[PDB]
Design an enzyme around this catalytic site. Sequence first.
Site, PDB file in Angstrom:
ATOM      1  N   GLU A 123     -55.206  79.408  -5.546  1.00 25.20           N
ATOM      2  CA  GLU A 123     -54.935  80.783  -5.964  1.00 25.20           C
ATOM      3  C   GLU A 123     -55.102  80.878  -7.480  1.00 25.20           C
ATOM      4  OE1 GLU A 123     -51.078  82.442  -5.055  1.00 25.20           O
ATOM      5  OE2 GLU A 123     -51.847  84.493  -5.016  1.00 25.20           O
ATOM      6  N   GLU A 267     -47.708  78.782  -2.275  1.00 26.01           N
ATOM      7  CA  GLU A 267     -47.306  78.940  -0.878  1.00 26.01           C
ATOM      8  C   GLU A 267     -48.358  78.524   0.159  1.00 26.01           C
ATOM      9  OE1 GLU A 267     -47.934  81.531  -2.923  1.00 26.01           O
ATOM     10  OE2 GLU A 267     -48.996  83.136  -1.859  1.00 26.01           O
ATOM     11  N   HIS A 300     -38.677  81.533  -2.336  1.00 25.53           N
ATOM     12  CA  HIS A 300     -39.866  82.336  -2.612  1.00 25.53           C
ATOM     13  C   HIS A 300     -41.079  81.880  -1.807  1.00 25.53           C
ATOM     14  CE1 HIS A 300     -42.391  84.928  -5.300  1.00 25.53           C
ATOM     15  NE2 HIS A 300     -43.312  84.063  -4.913  1.00 25.53           N
ATOM     16  N   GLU A 301     -41.418  80.600  -1.904  1.00 21.07           N
ATOM     17  CA  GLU A 301     -42.597  80.087  -1.215  1.00 21.07           C
ATOM     18  C   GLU A 301     -42.447  80.162   0.303  1.00 21.07           C
ATOM     19  OE1 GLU A 301     -44.913  79.835  -3.227  1.00 21.07           O
ATOM     20  OE2 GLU A 301     -43.688  79.696  -5.039  1.00 21.07           O
ATOM     21  N   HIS A 304     -43.002  83.727   1.690  1.00 19.24           N
ATOM     22  CA  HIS A 304     -44.432  84.021   1.677  1.00 19.24           C
ATOM     23  C   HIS A 304     -45.104  83.805   3.031  1.00 19.24           C
ATOM     24  CE1 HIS A 304     -46.054  85.522  -1.965  1.00 19.24           C
ATOM     25  NE2 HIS A 304     -45.688  84.516  -2.729  1.00 19.24           N
ATOM     26  N   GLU A 323     -46.444  89.656  -3.653  1.00 20.57           N
ATOM     27  CA  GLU A 323     -45.613  89.065  -4.697  1.00 20.57           C
ATOM     28  C   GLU A 323     -44.352  89.873  -4.984  1.00 20.57           C
ATOM     29  OE1 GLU A 323     -45.869  86.178  -5.508  1.00 20.57           O
ATOM     30  OE2 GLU A 323     -47.913  85.730  -4.857  1.00 20.57           O
TER      31      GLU A 323
HETATM   32  C1  LIG Z   1     -41.857  82.325  -9.101  1.00 20.58           C
HETATM   33  C2  LIG Z   1     -42.959  82.068 -10.133  1.00 20.58           C
HETATM   34  C3  LIG Z   1     -43.411  83.397 -10.743  1.00 20.58           C
HETATM   35  C4  LIG Z   1     -42.415  81.155 -11.233  1.00 20.58           C
HETATM   36  C5  LIG Z   1     -44.137  81.386  -9.434  1.00 20.58           C
HETATM   37  O1  LIG Z   1     -44.148  80.168  -9.266  1.00 20.58           O
HETATM   38  N1  LIG Z   1     -45.119  82.198  -9.019  1.00 20.58           N
HETATM   39  C6  LIG Z   1     -46.280  81.663  -8.293  1.00 20.58           C
HETATM   40  C7  LIG Z   1     -46.255  82.234  -6.872  1.00 20.58           C
HETATM   41  O2  LIG Z   1     -46.543  83.410  -6.652  1.00 20.58           O
HETATM   42  N2  LIG Z   1     -45.871  81.364  -5.929  1.00 20.58           N
HETATM   43  O3  LIG Z   1     -45.814  81.840  -4.569  1.00 20.58           O
HETATM   44  C8  LIG Z   1     -47.492  81.950  -8.925  1.00 20.58           C
HETATM   45  C9  LIG Z   1     -47.533  82.530 -10.188  1.00 20.58           C
HETATM   46  C10 LIG Z   1     -48.760  82.792 -10.794  1.00 20.58           C
HETATM   47  C11 LIG Z   1     -49.947  82.476 -10.141  1.00 20.58           C
HETATM   48  C12 LIG Z   1     -51.178  82.727 -10.743  1.00 20.58           C
HETATM   49  C13 LIG Z   1     -52.341  82.718  -9.981  1.00 20.58           C
HETATM   50  C14 LIG Z   1     -53.574  82.962 -10.582  1.00 20.58           C
HETATM   51  C15 LIG Z   1     -53.644  83.209 -11.948  1.00 20.58           C
HETATM   52  C16 LIG Z   1     -52.483  83.213 -12.712  1.00 20.58           C
HETATM   53  C17 LIG Z   1     -52.554  83.459 -14.079  1.00 20.58           C
HETATM   54  N3  LIG Z   1     -53.755  83.531 -14.648  1.00 20.58           N
HETATM   55  N4  LIG Z   1     -51.411  83.593 -14.764  1.00 20.58           N
HETATM   56  O4  LIG Z   1     -51.523  83.841 -16.197  1.00 20.58           O
HETATM   57  C18 LIG Z   1     -51.252  82.970 -12.109  1.00 20.58           C
HETATM   58  C19 LIG Z   1     -49.904  81.890  -8.881  1.00 20.58           C
HETATM   59  C20 LIG Z   1     -48.680  81.628  -8.278  1.00 20.58           C
HETATM   60 ZN   LIG Z   2     -45.433  84.173  -4.831  1.00 21.44          ZN
END
Ligand SMILES: CC(C)(C)C(=O)N[C@@H](C(=O)NO)c1ccc(-c2cccc(/C(N)=N/O)c2)cc1
Ligand SMILES: [Zn+2]
Length: 888
Positions: A123, A267, A300-301, A304, A323
């Site tokens: 991702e 996830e 969270h994961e 999903h 998200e």
């Molecule tokens: C809960 C938290 C926000 C800390 C996290 O781990 N989020 C990831 C997520 O949605 N897990 O299910 C997450 C966060 C960002 C990204 C993501 C994907 C692609 C590009 C980018 C990016 N360029 N960020 O600056 C960031 C992917 C997964």
């Molecule tokens: Zn997520």
Amino acid sequence: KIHYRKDYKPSGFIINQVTLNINIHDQETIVRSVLDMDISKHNVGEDLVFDGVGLKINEISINNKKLVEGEEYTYDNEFLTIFSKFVPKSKFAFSSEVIIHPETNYALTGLYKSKNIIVSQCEATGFRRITFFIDRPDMMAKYDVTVTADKEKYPVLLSNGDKVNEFEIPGGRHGARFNDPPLKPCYLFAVVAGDLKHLSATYITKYTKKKVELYVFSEEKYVSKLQWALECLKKSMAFDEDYFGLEYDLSRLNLVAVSDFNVGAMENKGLNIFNANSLLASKKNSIDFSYARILTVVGHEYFHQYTGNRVTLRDWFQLTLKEGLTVHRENLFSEEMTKTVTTRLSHVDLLRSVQFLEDSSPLSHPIRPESYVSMENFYTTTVYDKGSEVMRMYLTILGEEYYKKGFDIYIKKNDGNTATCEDFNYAMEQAYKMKKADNSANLNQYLLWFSQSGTPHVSFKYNYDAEKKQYSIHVNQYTKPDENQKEKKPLFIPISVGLINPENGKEMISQTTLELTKESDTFVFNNIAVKPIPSLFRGFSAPVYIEDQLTDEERILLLKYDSDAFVRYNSCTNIYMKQILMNYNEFLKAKNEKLESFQLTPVNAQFIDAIKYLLEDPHADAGFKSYIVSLPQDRYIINFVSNLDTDVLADTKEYIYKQIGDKLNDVYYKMFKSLEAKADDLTYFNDESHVDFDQMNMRTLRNTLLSLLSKAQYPNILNEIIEHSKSPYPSNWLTSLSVSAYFDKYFELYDKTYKLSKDDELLLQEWLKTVSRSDRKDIYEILKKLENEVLKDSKNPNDIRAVYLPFTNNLRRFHDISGKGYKLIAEVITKTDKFNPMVATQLCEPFKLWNKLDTKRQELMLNEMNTMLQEPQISNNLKEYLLRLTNK
Ligand SMILES: CC(C)(C)C(=O)N[C@@H](C(=O)NO)c1ccc(-c2cccc(/C(N)=N/O)c2)cc1
Ligand SMILES: [Zn+2]
Ligand SMILES: [Mg+2]
């Protein structure tokens, strides 16, 4: 190139089956892929164009006929173009063999090596870095994946689906075949290889009684830090069963921790991959926050699996649908598990400080943007956290019963399919019709929450007629015009309200949610026996700027006697902000007019008395107490001040803290001492299954109080600091380091805490954070020491973020008027951008407020950003981010 949301169109091609062979070697990984493809109804005889970034082509073929470069295809290291005349008009097979090298992949995108683990991250557009593909989420396919590697180095092989074969290979190698029949988008693909140790458990589903195997993985050194994560996973499965009635559908779920990760976790179906700092913990080697962190991220994961994996996205513009909705489900989960009011408060605190800043910055966008250049710059606090609040408002409007009905409609109607934000609103609208008891009711206006950027301002006017016992609340909403919408429209804003009798502190009406749908409205209440104090936006029922127009006397009364945690918390916030704004302007005028003498408005005495009252209440929440003695975040404050002079604000904060301290320090000390027994209770220190969030809140309070007492140089407080460093809890002895900054014993504890932290990778990163955040006059020399002695040339995102990000929160030092703080971070950004553009963009966060500062600091920040923009080798990620931020 700029992609637009309205320009969505299905591909002219279909990918039905993916058959992968991933062969990992020392100096290379050979990837063989066969794509069983077809022609879609949207095909107009176009060329076959695959995504493929940084791939080394050995051969590509169509129906087992080798293709010739130049004649039949071209490849520019980004797109593989096969000219239409060589593309079949029916079902066909595309095959390719490419070479990639995860060993030198420092961007941590696609397939890469983290210490001694080979791990993928696809991702959003990472799969194209592994093999050729039409890398978009609406391309659903079946996956048959085989992985081979050296057996000694990588005994554990993992991928999505069921492991169907395990075999030995000549030369000390071994292979594993994984088949995953259900359709999935390629960004949910994952592969893991390494010397992993595990903890495991069996979970039996609530309704169908299905046996699910749970596995959590890490490197051998940290296998003892896996237990809490496993507990959290079980809790997560239980909650989705109990609240949403959803069961896990696969036979096995793996959680894997890696040391080098750009975010928190991913996830991937059946194979969730985590940042080590978001999965691993032990009470001896982790601060208290790790336990809340792991619970939230694991939760969270897991959530999903339905909202993201079983119901997926049509396109990346719908990102908030999975998200925002998952963070919402994650927040419901955490609130239920922690059973403390500070959980909800912490989320509001983050939104109103970080997301509100973004929403008023040049980077401002709606939770469903209309365009993007870099989708890697898409995953924002707006999409995630405002998205979560927009999803949460559905619940507030519908109530728990009808929300669950609406959510169920959504899942049942869209399970196994792609979906859009309209699909969810439609499902919610169905429950809305049921609740409103008429099929004419709709949620068309609610869609504006998805398309309109900016934070709405909601203001109030009150009137009470003692004669007719009639009370009215006049409400107004307003969103400032920005670059996204010239004219803003009224939103559907749910306002959870209560009415407090100021004479006895009792609730005057039942639970009520005002539905504001116009630019302004007047809500009238009959049979109101006495003039009430309004309790507005209870639980923070809308992501808005709240302007309650209450007197400090009224806010104090709410703080003391209201039933809702947020409104109490917000009243305290509002009292602080009024004080902060008043003192700031007084300091500012004195500075501008170069006054020899001037006056400052003292902190409200009755307010200080109220704080003392709450602090001395044994039944009040300890975590709540830590908030009220803390001033609002700097990033929250800056939303209320034009041309913010950071030095003046620093002076303002210092005056206010000293004023309150001059009256309450004895109370603070008394509490710090009396709280010790329960807060540092060691009874369950060796039980990683026993986590007490209330107790951790008590330590938060103690450490907050200790910080206040240290800054105030409370008599003999250094003794308390020294004893605090002898505590078994890292939250305590790391606190002892930072609070010792105001004493000459600082570097003694610097060395002591380092020796305690240096042998645990994650703990050392927490030590770095503590040092980076230390209130030291010599902080720049200290940072230099960190770079030379500890950080060095580490490419670990955790290490880099630990050293630099906390320091940027040093209001006084980071915003040094020389601009050397701005220069320092910009150098780190540019340096990091060479190998990890994503983390480089993360490191740009302090510049997000650049146009909100005083003109001198505006010029200083702008110059550093333009300097970064002029770097010849600047990445597309960093360039687009800085271009947007600087309005170019
Ligand atoms: C809960 C938290 C926000 C800390 C996290 O781990 N989020 C990831 C997520 O949605 N897990 O299910 C997450 C966060 C960002 C990204 C993501 C994907 C692609 C590009 C980018 C990016 N360029 N960020 O600056 C960031 C992917 C997964
Ligand atoms: Zn997520
Ligand atoms: Mg149960």
